[PDB]
């Protein structure tokens with residue numbers, strides 16, 4: 270299958286886009302999943318250096334797989350401001366040559382929505398899908414705890430409620446496993462909507478809270494329990510056997526220390542495992 | 544006075560240390576306040592490129608003013624792990640040639656400590672001071688809401704309770720103003736302990752919550768109300784008149800968008816204002 274690197278793995282170190290691309294290339298990645306804030310800042314302040322890089326990506330068998338961001342469609346949100354952000358993301362996706370935008374479906378668990386709140390959010394996701402459909406771009410909701418996609422049945426339900434051809438899924442197997450669902454079974458049920466994967470692992474359920482966004486974004490955040498794919502509790506042998514003959518990128522979503530060492534080691538094992 | 548740039552201003556963009564140093568130099572900064580995670584990652588993965596930069600800093604009238612980090616000395620903390628982090632920070636400070644480490648005094652407001660919790664934290668700050676004193680390095684507590692330094696009297700009290708020669712203050716005037724204290728008066732009272740400043744401003748008290756750490760660290764975090772120094776509610780004319788003939792660096796602590804544009808514009812006004 271095709272592996273991608275996420276620039277979010279480098280959120281706590283000083284490194285240039287040029288050096289990320291070179292690292293991706295020399296380690297056999299075929300894609301880069303570009304964090305939205307990185308995309309935006311390259312466009313504003315590194316436009317020429319970035320354009321030169323983009324013009325050789327293809328020569329290195331690299332591409333931008335997706336831009337991964339956060340669209341606020343909560344009731345408290347200034348929705349016109351969210352729409353303006355979508356329009357800027359479509360500009361960035363055009364420049365980076367990607368047709369996918371990752372977002373999250375809400376900021377609390379499905380069980381905590383009233384049927385009325387869940388209705389208003391379905392309508393807003395639909396609106397965002399119709400905006401991106403003009404640009405022939407897909408909106409991928411990531412499967413995540415504390416969102417509407419925090420369980421397999423809620424995710425399936427959401428997809429049926431929005432009922433739009435440009436709404437797709439970024440399947441994050443760790444979070445799917447966390448919800449109590451079987452990873453292969455979730456893949457099989459979500460297959461018609463999947464366009465991308467996230468692969469990460471944890472040593473034990475005891476440490477799942479290290480993936481809470483606030484902990485992930487904090488420089489001094491806890492990394493205990495974050496482990497390479499074949500060294501954690503989720504069974505990546507079974508997952509990769511299922512997904513390896515789909516066409517979608519799987520990002521190695523590493524949030525721990527020493528990203529380059531971990532990523533480099535991961536790719537050697539991924540290419541050679543049985 | 545002497546101005547420094549904080550690498551934390553660049554936490555949401557891909558940029559190299561070499562480009563930060565060059566930007567600092569061409570805009571008349573005389574110092575760089577290096578975020579601890581940036582320092583650590585340069586040491587692990589960019590040691591040669593960083594060493595070459597460090598060897599010309601002096602030629603550019605630049606230096607590393609401080610490494611700014613987070614030491615967990617709460618009761619829930621693994622304190623031996625905190626001590627190990629201090630030992631690594633002393634290694635980094637040696638390499639970067641700085642004698643200052645910024646930390647925060649606790650993770651909740653002074654009013655929320657029992658006299659017993661506050662005692663245990665005083666003892667731990669004292670221990671950290673004694674560790675860094677071996678390396679002839681100073682521990683600077685930053686004045687911050689939701690910490691023991693959230694008011695001027697609590698900060699003064701803390702300094703008297705620890706009573707160690709290596710405990711110093713990083714005076715963040717915005718947060719001091721937020722606490723209800725007068726900035727110039729706080730400078731005058733805290734003067735014997737001050738070794739560094741942070742300068743940032745806000746358009747109105749209504750927007751002070753945008754400085755909450757979780758909001759600051761999040762890529763999609765709100766930046767509304769963050770404004771250049773002379774365009775906000777805190778009076779930087781009065782502050783700079785007081786502090787301009789001290790020897791301490793003042794960092795332009797910008798957490799908003801377009802850091803390079805904002806910082807470049809700031810330095811032109813700072814050099815030329817009356």
Ligand SMILES: [Cl-]
Pocket residue numbers: 312313314315316317
């Ligand atoms: Cl540019």
Ligand SMILES: [Cl-]
Pocket residue numbers: 586587588589590591
């Ligand atoms: Cl190195």
Ligand SMILES: [Mn+2]
Pocket residue numbers: 411441467522
């Ligand atoms: Mn993910």
Ligand SMILES: [Mn+2]
Pocket residue numbers: 685715741796
């Ligand atoms: Mn500050």
